Each structure stands twice: as structure tokens, then as C-alpha cells.
Amino acid sequence: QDYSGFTLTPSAQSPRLLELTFTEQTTKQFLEQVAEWPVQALEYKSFLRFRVGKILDDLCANQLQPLLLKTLLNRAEGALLINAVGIDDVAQADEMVKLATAVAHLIGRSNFDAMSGQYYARFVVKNYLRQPHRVMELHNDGTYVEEITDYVLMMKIDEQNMQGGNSLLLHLDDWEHLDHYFRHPLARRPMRFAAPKDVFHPVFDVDQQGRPVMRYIDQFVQPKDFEEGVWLSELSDAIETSKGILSVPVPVGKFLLINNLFWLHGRDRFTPHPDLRRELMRQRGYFAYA
């Protein structure tokens, strides 16, 4: 398939993860057509988040939106690494926020983020949970609020003096222990989840066709007793040692966009360096389509 305005190819890590790259021409026209709205105008007026999405999609002859949706909702796939030729440097952070906003608002809506007070959040890492030699464990987002998070978007804004730190991904259908954990008696028992109002939901559920989906994070699940706590500790080990995990470099200017129901994500350890600098932007939300 030859698409209008972008190309599409499988990643080096997995055929489940597709790489979508906007052509230089699409990128220039996009930036020109959204220059009248600074990032602040997107912050203030949520309708402009959808408008910039429409602008990008029209520049791709209305082929982008159905491709995004089909890829993210397809159980066999459900993940994209996305970039635009010519947006690849920390000095273009505003342009990166604009691009990611447009893509996200073609498939749904980005929820309010408590860490920033906006629909997206940016974080800066320089040199117990912020240990460089520790892996951030695989998890799903949104486990401690009532409404389901359908997607997670993570964009690399900057990277300096950085060895390691790849994003880690696990698709449930590549996880060799899924069948063992999904069939356990505890799998579909509602458990308490709390951040530091509590919600109750199981670790596993099923999609419309009956296939397993997952809502799990070690930090926010609150086992009520020994039985639950021992089972969860083993679950954790069975995720973290999986042979199906992907290790994905996210270069500056690219972002991962993944279906949060059947992908888990995390982050690899990295080398400490006095002049290390890593900057990320995230957006999480719900799918909505006509």
C-alpha cells in the first residue's frame, strides 16, 4: 500500500509495531497550517486539539485517521512508532507537542493530567524509584481511576549522554505465561487499586470477542490478604522475566502510541552520567470514532 503523505513499515523489533513517518512535505505544510495556534491555544481551547488533527488528516487525503484506528484496534498489532521528517530536535518541542496532539485527537481524546494540569505532560530526567540501574516494571496506565485509558502516547523530546533506557513493551499474545495467569481463580476477582477515592476491578478482563485484556500495575494494586499478595508477587516475576518483551529505542522526535488494554509498557535501566538529560511527553486517553 502506498499512502498519501506518510510511509509505513514494520519495526526492527516486531511486526506488531509499525513505524509511520510523515514526509517532509506533509510536515512543512502541517506546521504552516497550524502556526496560528501556539501550544498555549491548544491548552486553553480543547476543540483546537481536534482541528489540528483534521488539518493533518486532510493533508494525508483522509487516509491517516482510518489507518490509525485500524492499527490501534487490531489485536494482532495495536502499536505505532510515529515521527515526522524534519522534527527531530529539542528546539522543536512545541512542534512535537502539536504533532502528537493532532494524531491523538484523530483517534479519541487526551485526558487531563494531574502532574501538569494540562491534557499532556512533559518531564525532565537528570542524573529508590528514580534509580538509573532499575528497570521500570511493565504495567498498564489508568489502573486507579474509574474510566478506562484506551491509549498511551510517549514521545521523546530530548536525549543527551544516554546509554540504555529503551521503552519496554509486552503484547499479551507474546506473553508465554498468559494462559496460566488468566485461568487462575484470582484472575477475574475484583481487587482494590489506589494511588498514594479507591476503585475496584480485576487484573484481567476480556474484550468483546472473549480474549484476555489486562489492567495491572505493581505499585497501585492493593491485595487484601496473603493469598492475593503472594499471587500478585508471582505474576510480577512472570511478567518481568518474559521472553516476549520488546526493547524499543525511541529517538528524539518520535513517539509510541499503543493500545493500553493488550500492551504493557515500561522502561529499561540506563547508565548514570553527570550530564545526562532525557525529556519525555505523555498523553493518555479514550478511543472515540464515528
Residues that bind its own copies (CB under 8 A): 38, 40-41, 44-51, 53-54, 65, 105-106, 108-109, 117, 128-129, 182-183, 188, 196, 206, 208-212, 218-219, 221-230, 232-233, 236, 288-290
Contact string (CB under 5 A) for Fe ion, positions 110-149, x = contact? -------------------------------x--------
What residue 110 binds from its own copies, Fe ion, none (CB within 5 to 8 A, per partner kind)?
A: none
CA pair distance 254, 49, nearest whole angstrom = 19
Residue 184 annotated as binding site: no
Q: Distance between alpha carbon 217 and the CA centroid of its chain, in Å? A: 15
3-state secondary structure of 51: helix
What residue 116 binds from its own copies, Fe ion, none (CB within 5 to 8 A, per partner kind)?
A: none
- Please enumerate in sequence order all residues whose Cβ is within 8 A of that of 49, keeping only pairs 6 or more positions apart, or say none: 42, 101, 102, 104, 105, 109, 110, 119
Q: How far is the CB of 234 from its own copies (least distance, A)?
A: 9
What residue 9 binds from Fe ion, its own copies, none (CB within 5 to 8 A, per partner kind)?
A: none
Q: How far is the CB of 265 from Fe ion (least distance, A)?
A: 6
Residue 235 vs 250, nearer CB to its own copies: 235
Q: Which residue has the cell 526492527?
A: 12
What residue 141 binds from its own copies, Fe ion, none (CB within 5 to 8 A, per partner kind)?
A: Fe ion
Using the CB atoms, write b or e for 39-64: b if 16+ within 10 Å. Answer: beebbeeeebbeebbebbbebbeeeb
Strands, sheet with 221-222, edge to edge from the N-terminal-most edge strand: 199-201, 191-193, 221-222
Residue 139 annotated as binding site: yes
Contact between 18 and 79 under an 8 Å Cβ cutoff? The reply is yes
CA pair distance 107, 54, nearest whole angstrom = 11
Q: How far is the CB of 42 from its own copies (least distance, A)?
A: 10
Residue 141 vs 279, nearer CB to Fe ion: 141
H-type helices in 164-266, by residue range?
A: 178-183, 226-240
Cα separations (Å) of 218 from 35, 131, 139, 140, 229?
A: 42, 17, 8, 10, 10
The grid coordinates listed for 102 are 493532532
What residue 143 binds from Fe ion, its own copies, none (CB within 5 to 8 A, per partner kind)?
A: none
Residue 265 annotated as binding site: yes
- Residue (of 4, 40, 7, 11) closest to 258 by Cα position: 11
What residue 209 binds from Fe ion, its own copies, none (CB within 5 to 8 A, per partner kind)?
A: its own copies
Q: How far is the CB of 276 from its own copies (least distance, A)?
A: 22
Q: How far is the CB of 173 from Fe ion (least distance, A)?
A: 20
Residue 13 vs 111, nearer CB to its own copies: 111
Binding site for Fe ion (CB under 5 A): 141
Annotated binding site for Fe cation: 139, 141, 265
Annotated binding site: 139, 141, 265
